[PDB]
Write a protein that holds these residues in place. Structure first.
Motif, PDB file in Angstrom:
ATOM      1  N   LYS A 173     -11.156   5.586  -4.746  1.00 56.35           N
ATOM      2  CA  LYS A 173      -9.544   4.791  -4.030  1.00 56.35           C
ATOM      3  C   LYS A 173      -8.585   5.312  -5.200  1.00 56.35           C
ATOM      4  N   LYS A 204     -13.912  -3.106  -3.566  1.00 57.26           N
ATOM      5  CA  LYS A 204     -13.449  -2.374  -2.040  1.00 57.26           C
ATOM      6  C   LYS A 204     -12.299  -2.627  -1.712  1.00 57.26           C
ATOM      7  N   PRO A 205     -11.588  -2.671  -0.932  1.00 59.19           N
ATOM      8  CA  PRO A 205     -10.057  -2.481  -0.499  1.00 59.19           C
ATOM      9  C   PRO A 205     -10.468  -3.688   0.501  1.00 59.19           C
ATOM     10  N   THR A 249      -5.606   6.866  -1.066  1.00 59.56           N
ATOM     11  CA  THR A 249      -6.664   7.018  -2.371  1.00 59.56           C
ATOM     12  C   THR A 249      -4.648   7.485  -3.616  1.00 59.56           C
ATOM     13  N   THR A 283       0.372   5.769  -4.077  1.00 54.21           N
ATOM     14  CA  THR A 283      -1.273   6.265  -2.709  1.00 54.21           C
ATOM     15  C   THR A 283      -1.218   7.082  -1.611  1.00 54.21           C
ATOM     16  N   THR A 322     -16.213   3.737  -5.071  1.00 56.34           N
ATOM     17  CA  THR A 322     -17.172   2.460  -4.932  1.00 56.34           C
ATOM     18  C   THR A 322     -17.937   2.387  -4.188  1.00 56.34           C
TER      19      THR A 322
END
Lengths: 111, 111
Positions: free
Chosen positions: B8, A110-111, B103, B85, A13
């Motif tokens: 991510k 972005k999250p 991640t 994740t 990101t």
């Protein structure tokens, strides 16, 4: 000699520091390892240990160590402009000797 | 305190060692940082500095250093079973205090 890039793709990101991993499986032949974004004549030099100034780039390991095999780099401040495939490339003393398979950098939200 | 996971997603291939990056922006409150795969009660413990044996996992930095803020780990020998994740999670002295955004590890074909 193999040029290993374990990660095919990193989704990063904006603003992050991305780590591009590369290892060599042999210390010979003698020659520098360079990083490029892209392939072919239009490719962009991203890092050269030998020489040059790359303010956004640091190396994970000390490349001046005799038995160093870690050519991983950290690129800070990623923007959409950094997307591409990054290749870790070994030269012979220069002519290109072997390239890694490339690590794609892609940009995510972005999250 | 922020738990930063810059990547991510990592696309890895079978047999590779994957590096999951995590940094904390503060040394307080006091508490251990654990790694999990998944969220909720069914989540799997991947690493605990405090204690336990995690033969596939090593830490990039020395977690016993007073001012350490790097909680990045390397997981060797990735298989399709490792997709998921991975969350870097700070506990207070234990109760969960803050989690990183996660991640994702995905599996890709070899070049």
């Amino acid at each position: 000699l193999q040029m290993i890039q374990p990660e095919k793709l990193l989704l990063v990101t904006v603003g992050k520091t991305a780590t591009l991993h590369c290892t060599v499986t042999s210390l010979l032949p003698v020659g520098p390892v360079l990083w490029f974004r892209g392939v072919g004549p239009g490719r962009e030099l991203i890092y050269n240990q030998k020489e040059g100034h790359f303010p956004r780039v640091t190396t994970v390991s000390d490349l001046t160590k005799r038995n160093n095999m870690d050519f991983s780099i950290r690129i800070s401040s990623i923007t959409p402009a950094d997307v591409g495939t990054y290749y870790c490339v070994k030269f012979r003393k220069n002519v290109e000797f072997k390239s890694g398979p490339g690590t794609e950098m892609a940009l995510g939200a972005k999250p």
